[PDB]
Design a protein around this ligand. Structure first.
Ligand SMILES: Nc1ncnc2c1ncn2[C@@H]1O[C@H](COP(=O)(O)OP(=O)(O)O)[C@@H](O)[C@H]1O
Ligand SMILES: Nc1ncnc2c1ncn2[C@@H]1O[C@H](COP(=O)(O)OP(=O)(O)O)[C@@H](O)[C@H]1O
Ligand SMILES: Nc1ncnc2c1ncn2[C@@H]1O[C@H](COP(=O)(O)OP(=O)(O)O)[C@@H](O)[C@H]1O
Ligand SMILES: Nc1ncnc2c1ncn2[C@@H]1O[C@H](COP(=O)(O)OP(=O)(O)O)[C@@H](O)[C@H]1O
Ligand SMILES: Nc1ncnc2c1ncn2[C@@H]1O[C@H](COP(=O)(O)OP(=O)(O)O)[C@@H](O)[C@H]1O
Ligand SMILES: C[P@](=O)(CC[C@H](N)C(=O)O)OP(=O)(O)O
Ligand SMILES: C[P@](=O)(CC[C@H](N)C(=O)O)OP(=O)(O)O
Ligand SMILES: C[P@](=O)(CC[C@H](N)C(=O)O)OP(=O)(O)O
Ligand SMILES: C[P@](=O)(CC[C@H](N)C(=O)O)OP(=O)(O)O
Ligand SMILES: C[P@](=O)(CC[C@H](N)C(=O)O)OP(=O)(O)O
Ligand SMILES: [Mn+2]
Ligand SMILES: [Mn+2]
Ligand SMILES: [Mn+2]
Ligand SMILES: [Mn+2]
Ligand SMILES: [Mn+2]
Ligand SMILES: [Mn+2]
Ligand SMILES: [Mn+2]
Ligand SMILES: [Mn+2]
Ligand SMILES: [Mn+2]
Ligand SMILES: [Mn+2]
Ligand SMILES: [Mn+2]
Ligand SMILES: [Mn+2]
Ligand SMILES: [Mn+2]
Ligand SMILES: [Mn+2]
Ligand SMILES: [Mn+2]
Lengths: 353, 353, 353, 353, 353
């Protein structure tokens, strides 16, 4: 029957390939994709033809001038179609070669090409938290309808049927990602029952943004299979329940070398000064998450400390004791555009004075 | 149990083959098929025996003179029975060798054999849109019964459980088709939730028609497996919801060579003059689709433009900028007979003056 | 679909590994785990990097000083993720290298390193009994809701649908454990319908504790898959229904050699004197189990005998008739921390006089 | 069985009475009630004993000083218990005779006792709109779960099963209210499917506030019976669906006498000047309702007109043509405290200059 | 519980009355109603105050000039609210006293006031056929979903569970109507399973129209209670299944007196000449019903005969044999506006020459 067809091995019959072009839609938060057949395997992004789609249907163009252009930027193996088929992360342009307003990759690319940044070779590990929800009722997975599970406490990194909801989805994603070639560093059950996390491990500059988006694309496709819905809303349930963020861990060449801890403090300092303008691009709805309770710092103050999950930035015990490592900006929400957060951190930390 | 039997590998036990003869029924819109055993593998259509069926049961013949004859025309691998078994696309005739009124392949074959057409070597890519429906209630897949989903917008090329209904079926079909040997160029989720699309990529003359029909046959067989119903009705739900069409993309030898864009304009021009008579054969119910809203042009006007999804014909940005390519006739409905549309375009575009 | 992704073989695509760090949480009875990617296979515990987690979320640290450190101590193969992926049993410390109050491995390690203990090379076989419960109602698997099955009698080591509930889970676990490298000696259906047992066979000193914990981790993960709940509560149902214990079988070098039976009696003797203080660490709720009925001895008396399941300690017919073997301390409850019971027995039996 | 007991006629057995004391709770939007037995029928409010309740449980007092006092203010017949039993609308005070912060009846009473207001003898008709919701899912009655009914249009004052949801409840309420002695002037199905309205007809000064609250109490008690939930949230569903308000119709002695239309215009004028401060007390969430679409006027502008449902105030065709009547302030939300809106209008309209 | 409240007898507690004003909405086919309280019983229409409603919500007025006026024209007892409560049939006007375009009572009233018509004192019996449908699926009551019952034949005037669907509703209606004061002459099960009929017996001129509308109002309210949907669509199911009409039986003074049969033939004759223009106002969709099969006459021909259910007009055996009676115009569809058909027959039959 149905899975025999979806899992057909094509290699036995043609050289042809299926490429799934992924892009980001009109809201800056919606992933979209379509697929095309290509005549043979491809490993280099610049050897893939450009393409277009109906921008008038994604809120990015008018009906009379509907075409919007897709620039292939990164290739990953398609864990769904398997064999030689591929996912292609994309960039969006007018037919005139202008990047459209919702393309935030272009700006970020410039910052990561700019040679004083490139030389610092920044590293990002981003911690994507999300929440799983029952289709149609829109209530968190594992929660009874019109009710709540036991209070927070046993859920964080837990095991068992009354504690841990949807490991299925999570472990699936983890391998999918690995197979695809995403640098995924690890996963964990989070504090609010039904909330999970994966980390896209230390990735350089632009490719961090690319990998987080593709990882999210894979997550949602998996949840789609499962008949479950994901939100990246930073505070999906009001009251005594954790919000969800996208912690950004960060380091520069000079931060991970001898006496980098000094560079770290100095970077934090610069961040303190540009808190206000960082918050503004750190994803919407954040006001509902950053309250000072539930392992956040208040939106209005900026703070930092060592093992302090109540602070705006946190520095690992390990990197303190070694005088070198990385720090964690805990401010960005789970619905953060990594392109924006990732480059803005480099900019406020290297370029600006 | 049941799938062990349906998936038996016959190769281990005989040389014998199963051929599924497919034809088009009395309404010109209903596919029909039966199967026979053949003594060994066959790769050439003319080496398959002709056959007959009970036309009195498909509305094509009377009871007392019931026999109607099947001419094998194209072979494809059967993605259901797998191994060496085959699908055989067919043509319909009286025992006297007359093509029956519902055989539109014969006319089309003549036009594509006619040497001034053949030399121009026309190319067609056809975009089959369709809609998936819940068995028995006849309401679109994923829609709640006696109600509607959220308004159009997030569905086009979307991902996730609350957005994307029946990817299962779609991805299955895609591989099925590839395996079978249909030149299928790509797929995508369409604008109305539950509506999808596949494209039968650039195919020459008569074989375009053959492949579209066989692709439709595979689609409906898959939906059958799934316990879901397909309509090719061009406007299945009334009101603020997309209709479904069968866009025909077209090019001639001279159109894809240097300065073909001029030939394109001239062809469009000829099309403008024969709009009235094209509409008449562009599938029934089209009046309900072509309204000027929802990415169509009004039935009564003819128009064209560059990236204009509101026009009767559209010319890609890419082919404009290259002075050579193809244009898209957006007029045909999803229930179009590709034999009719495909040849009628060649006729109005090459032969007539 | 979903199990195709969870069962992806990673070996075909990278050298990378997934390690699941397991630890024991704030209540001393809750297992917790998270996973990370490592660059290649690892077989030695000391070659695994140390790690940390949010102790503020497991009741082990404050929010402002939240980091707690994980020391890898034992590696086993992950029977879930399979291939080269691993489970890593852990130990808990402050960033200052202090063992936290809930780390009972550290104390036990000292006792088993201490050279007069090491030389006696103690052996432990521990019999983990547990009960399976329906999710949400929290009533034993196979029991009708708000009611009881037939009285005890046909359930112990039974077979058939009306007698034996959840063998599925049990047999799964058994192989899981073997695969993982736990020395699991055997399994059996227990006396109360829905209650089962596995034995972690003769294991030396500290590794007994390690293996029991990891075996429990595997059990609960399996039940999680099954949509069923486990309790290690020593007496889950009040009345005429068996409780659950963690019998510890024990032997020293000198006990299993010629005329060890004398050493056995002498050990029992020492145990009689420290009954009071053993009970106190033999797991909470034990008062509800050890009643003198249902194959226990009363908490307040200490007793021993030969084939006597009504005594506090029991000595096998086999080891009596051979003048050498091991004895069974039937006192510990099913929710016993094996680190505590296992070393406390060595201490009261070798060191103290 | 159960309704035989609930409907027992007590008259046949004692003179005793049951009085249900109703009051308004800590949030200023939550009705609360408890019942006591009284020795014989009572018709005058001042002949009912005062009472108290646990304010610490309604967010109105601390635990150590928990008593809050209830002043009977209005009697109505209890339509649930029937016979001679009564509902008693209440007022809230400290034991020291201070009105508590959430008692808005006291202020309003003062304004309606103040002799220049009393002499003008103001009249209020208030139009309570509300929405009916499915228990637990919190989605509007008659809507399919995770979906929407047909667009607005056939619902307003409609009849039939596919159009009209919960008439049951509505018609019940209507008679309940009449029986009770509420001056209820009429009912109607509103624009958004599942939304209804009742009017508390022309009532003088303080008693308008009293009757609206008691009418709301009766409504919710009825929906409680039905196993359905009510919201007075002014905009329960986002998007192309009506919000809900509490239109206040108003007239003074001088407005309903010869050439009152002049007094009306002058009153409107005064209202224009105090729009800002009226909005602030016209119920919370109003920003989400008053948008200028769906028969509201934008929160930021003030406007008036004759038959204009798009304006902030509307004057009936009937009262224009007669040079005398009443005008409709369409600004208050459905969650308005009538005590506050009702007196504030008298104050801005008579006292202030 | 709920029916105790809906059936409260108000007479025991006030003199007050509930009046349900009914009118016809923007489509000319949708009934609408709302209710008001009146101070005492009323028996004469002209003693009821006029009223208004929001025409902007029924498609009859703009938002800025929203008021539309209701003229009470006929009173009937409300069979739902019972006691002294009343239904009030209405007429629609601008505030300027113009009848709105959808008010067809005004025209008809003129024709029935015009003294040469009045003197002929026309009589109408109209046969309302309708179909009952399952809510949400919109498939006829008693039909299995996605299928059909046995072929027509045993359904007409049938009895039994496999033959007769919804008698409940029907018998309820019948008494309701009688109670209300509608001159309802009789009922019967019709030919297509799930289709019924009632007749509004011999009623004079304008009051026929009034009574048919109010009868329809009562029908749909009843079906609403039942959780069932009604259509007056003339041909709800395509194929071998009866359509639904609104046969109009007609007689004038001179037709029911000695040798009226001559006047009858002459009237028929006049009708033959104005068939074309009668058809145009005889309700929309009629083309799908009037086919010449299933007891209709073809739309394009006009015919008459004696006991002929295949003709456009039919004359009873009884009135033929008596040389005096009435004839049956079988042409109007079930969705006919009786005001239009009823007066148009008088006009073509008396006034015009
Ligand atoms: N030097 C570094 N610079 C930037 N990121 C790093 C560095 N070292 C490790 N990381 C990344 O930071 C991430 C932190 O993940 P996790 O263990 O969830 O963080 P936390 O415990 O702070 O929540 C991992 O992706 C890791 O790849
Ligand atoms: N040069 C050509 N001549 C005719 N058909 C072509 C030509 N080039 C491409 N096609 C086909 O026409 C189809 C276009 O489909 P699609 O990608 O859906 O276009 P749209 O932008 O209208 O969605 C594809 O099959 C494409 O391969
Ligand atoms: N000499 C020994 N020292 C420690 N454990 C032993 C020794 N001999 C056997 N065992 C173990 O004791 C356990 C046997 O448990 P089990 O069959 O449940 O005992 P019983 O059923 O008699 O109460 C297993 O751990 C077995 O591997
Ligand atoms: N003179 C008056 N002054 C104040 N309110 C009045 C006066 N006359 C009537 N009312 C009341 O105002 C309320 C408006 O009800 P309704 O007819 O539903 O309003 P709308 O037409 O705005 O829906 C009713 O209670 C009506 O009886
Ligand atoms: N002289 C008349 N004029 C008008 N209607 C009449 C006259 N005599 C009887 N009727 C009525 O005509 C209607 C008859 O419809 P019905 O009994 O269903 O007839 P059929 O057998 O034509 O279906 C009823 O209102 C009946 O009372
Ligand atoms: C549990 P936590 O300590 C806090 C993050 C939290 N889920 C949030 O509100 O951002 O996450 P992590 O940073 O260890 O992943
Ligand atoms: C979304 P669309 O732009 C328009 C097709 C539409 N479903 C129709 O009504 O013909 O499809 P395509 O051009 O990407 O083929
Ligand atoms: C029959 P049993 O003695 C069961 C022991 C009992 N569940 C308990 O409460 O100790 O089995 P074994 O493990 O001792 O062989
Ligand atoms: C039809 P409407 O104008 C509705 C206005 C709307 N429901 C709202 O206040 O938001 O109410 P009413 O005045 O007829 O009661
Ligand atoms: C039996 P019939 O011809 C039914 C009318 C038929 N269903 C139609 O299409 O008009 O009418 P009657 O019994 O009501 O006169
Ligand atoms: Mn983390
Ligand atoms: Mn986290
Ligand atoms: Mn973190
Ligand atoms: Mn397309
Ligand atoms: Mn399309
Ligand atoms: Mn197209
Ligand atoms: Mn045992
Ligand atoms: Mn046991
Ligand atoms: Mn034992
Ligand atoms: Mn109103
Ligand atoms: Mn209203
Ligand atoms: Mn109003
Ligand atoms: Mn009849
Ligand atoms: Mn009839
Ligand atoms: Mn009739």
């Amino acid at each position: 029957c149905l899975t025999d067809l979806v899992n057909l091995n094509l290699s036995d019959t043609t050289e042809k390939i299926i490429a799934e072009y992924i892009w980001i839609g009109g809201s800056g938060m919606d992933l979209r994709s379509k697929a095309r057949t290509l005549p043979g395997p491809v490993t280099d992004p610049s050897k893939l033809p450009k393409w277009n789609y109906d921008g008038s249907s994604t809120g990015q163009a008018p009906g009379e001038d509907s075409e919007v252009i897709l620039y292939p930027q990164a290739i990953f193996k398609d864990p769904f179609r398997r064999g030689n088929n591929i996912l292609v992360m994309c960039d969006c342009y007018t037919p005139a070669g202008e990047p459209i307003p919702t393309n935030k990759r272009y700006s970020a690319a410039k910052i990561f090409s700019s040679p004083e940044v490139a030389a610092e070779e920044p590293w990002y590990g981003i911690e994507q938290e999300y929440t799983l929800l029952q289709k149609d009722t829109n209530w968190p997975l594992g929660w009874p309808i019109g009710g709540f599970p036991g209070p927070q406490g046993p859920y964080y990194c837990g095991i068992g049927a009354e504690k841990s909801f949807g490991r299925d989805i999570v472990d699936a994603h983890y391998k999918a990602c690995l197979y695809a070639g995403i640098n995924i560093s690890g996963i964990n059950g989070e504090v609010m029952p039904g909330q999970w996390e994966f980390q896209v491990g230390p990735s350089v500059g632009i490719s961090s943004g690319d990998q987080v988006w593709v990882a999210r694309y894979i997550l949602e496709r998996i949840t789609e299979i499962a008949g479950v819905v994901v939100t990246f809303d930073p505070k999906p349930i009001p009251g005594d329940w954790n919000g969800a963020g996208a912690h950004t861990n960060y380091s520069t060449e000079s931060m991970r070398k001898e006496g980098g801890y000094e560079v770290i403090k100095a970077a934090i300092e610069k961040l303190k000064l540009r808190h206000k303008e960082h918050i503004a691009a750190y994803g919407e709805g954040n006001e509902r998450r950053l309250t000072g309770r539930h392992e956040t710092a208040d939106i209005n103050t900026f703070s930092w400390g060592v093992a302090n999950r109540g602070a705006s930035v946190r520095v690992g015990r390990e990197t303190e004791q070694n005088g070198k490592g990385y720090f964690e900006d805990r401010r960005p929400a789970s619905n953060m555009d990594p392109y924006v957060v990732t480059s803005m951190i480099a900019e406020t930390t290297i370029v600006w004075k």
